[PDB]
Write a protein that binds this ligand. Sequence first.
Ligand SMILES: NCc1c[nH]c2nc(N)[nH]c(=O)c12
Ligand SMILES: NCc1c[nH]c2nc(N)[nH]c(=O)c12
Ligand SMILES: [Zn+2]
Ligand SMILES: [Zn+2]
Lengths: 348, 348
Amino acid sequence: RPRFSFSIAAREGKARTGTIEMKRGVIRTPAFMPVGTAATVKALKPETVRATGADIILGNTYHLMLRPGAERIAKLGGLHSFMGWDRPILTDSGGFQVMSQSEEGVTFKSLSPERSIEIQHLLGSDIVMAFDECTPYPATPSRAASSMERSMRWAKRSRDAFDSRKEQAENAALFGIQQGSVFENLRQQSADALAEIGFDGYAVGGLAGGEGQDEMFRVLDFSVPMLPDDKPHYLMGVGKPDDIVGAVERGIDMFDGQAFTWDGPINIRNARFSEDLKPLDSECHCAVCQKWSRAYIHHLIRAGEILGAMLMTEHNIAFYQQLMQKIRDSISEGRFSQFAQDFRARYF
Amino acid sequence: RPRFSFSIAAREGKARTGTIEMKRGVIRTPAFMPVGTAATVKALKPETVRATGADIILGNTYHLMLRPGAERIAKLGGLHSFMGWDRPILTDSGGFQVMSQSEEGVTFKSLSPERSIEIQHLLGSDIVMAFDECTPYPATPSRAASSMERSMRWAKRSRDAFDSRKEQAENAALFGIQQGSVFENLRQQSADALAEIGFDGYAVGGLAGGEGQDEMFRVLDFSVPMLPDDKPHYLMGVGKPDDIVGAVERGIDMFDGQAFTWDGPINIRNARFSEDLKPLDSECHCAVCQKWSRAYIHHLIRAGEILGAMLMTEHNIAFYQQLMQKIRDSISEGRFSQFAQDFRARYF
Ligand SMILES: NCc1c[nH]c2nc(N)[nH]c(=O)c12
Ligand SMILES: NCc1c[nH]c2nc(N)[nH]c(=O)c12
Ligand SMILES: [Zn+2]
Ligand SMILES: [Zn+2]
């Protein structure tokens, strides 16, 4: 395999399906990435994560740098070896979680473009995120501009740091992050700036920050076409099943007691499930739905048992992976419009 | 398979190895039973429990009767179906955890011989424990006598309740519990009384209550020979690896951050493990020791991650099952004395 090769196999309107080939594996797109916080996808062994269909997981730089530490993970062989996941890992830059300051970077109590890229290198990340400056929502045009401009300066710094490390440049990929809040002109300037520097993929940053779905979709309508068509488009911090379907309709390729079902989410703790022998979802192919009832999982979660968390998480990630598979198949078959309509009529 | 058949394949001194055949499976003895509290072995799927080598698990009547409830579990198909474990289950009587009162039974804020046997029936238990009255440690001779006598009256009541339920009598087994504190004469009276009523197996109750290993072993020295030789001997609430080895030497067949190793326990949270790439134990065949380091599990437990609990528990139960296997093989091969000596020299 190559370091990085993104190929589009099929399109329907703005939606695309294809593959990212990397040294550690192939990523099917549109892709959903389970999140590893502190070097573990919560309550799952890596083999269980894989069994759900995930091709790639996300690691959080902010949390790993604090515990157990980036240099320590490198001394132990890198993140993949440490946690036992041998396929691609995307690492965020750490910037977001710092927020949830100067032109050089940020200092905080328990980072810079250069230090973020270095930490991601020490972890052994396959997809490295440029270090950006968070724009809160809402933001005035002046402040959104100032932060976007700083982020573009930091994108160049991130590029140059990554490139100046040969092993990283040869084995990993680097994604840039579009900023600009909800403002079309600022999104355009940001896309232009990122394309001029050149990245392996382009994230839409700054959304899912409190603006609501209608507004997010409005911004995606004009923002995703600004990005290079031939590279992956990553919507950071999204999301809910319906958000994913609408974002794919707008050209996004990658994403990162409540149980998901094709009729909508349920809260398994509710008393109505105490004697319900049905699986969490009636069609779901996951191992949880094959073997255990709603009634048992209700009991486990209300009892605070670890197995409850294990079973709920495996089901939910499997559900998301089945969603992504149905999206990929429908786009490849030229019936994604109908899938999205059918999905919404029932989920709601 | 029969309802119940215990066969002794080999002996060495007081130690025995053999099998209990039941409708749901064969139990290899000496046996270690993982404990299911609130219908789950903590942090493990049933298939993982089985993969460690366990033949049988323990269910706690006190906890199940409170949450989710005995009648509810019966309505849902019984404990085996509810939790997804299809092999034998031993249920305790509920009496111990009530303590941790009258001749009819006990009332408490969140049971009788008859109600305990009924709850165990509603759960679908394969091995049912008679309902006894707990003797604290230390206990005076008068009080130990009074409680033992009450327990023997309750053993007869337990017998008669079990027998008067045809489905239970035909498909499950009933074990009696020897009491008498640390007093040889009271242990003798209790053994005699239980043998006269007749049970499928005999537990040594009332130990591991604060008396310490030397005292426990002294009591086992005279108490286990009093029980019928041709039935299983169950030491309730024991225990530590060294306690198990010495108890098997005295004729026991069944048992119910710290990681066990053949060099002794370690506390994985200790800083000395933060960069230790070795598995938890150097010889252990379990999946955890095949795949993850001490350093990773150190991190997970110190971070409060659920996967830490999952991995530690799987290793520890696998360790116990490997111990039991090495005990069974050494007795069958007539080298258990040497095993016990070798085990202690290294564990300590
Ligand atoms: N939802 C937006 C978001 C989530 N995580 C992020 N991490 C970074 N670096 N930038 C971003 O804009 C975001
Ligand atoms: N360690 C003694 C013990 C543990 N659990 C028990 N449950 C019952 N019914 N009786 C007992 O003596 C014990
Ligand atoms: Zn499922
Ligand atoms: Zn192990």
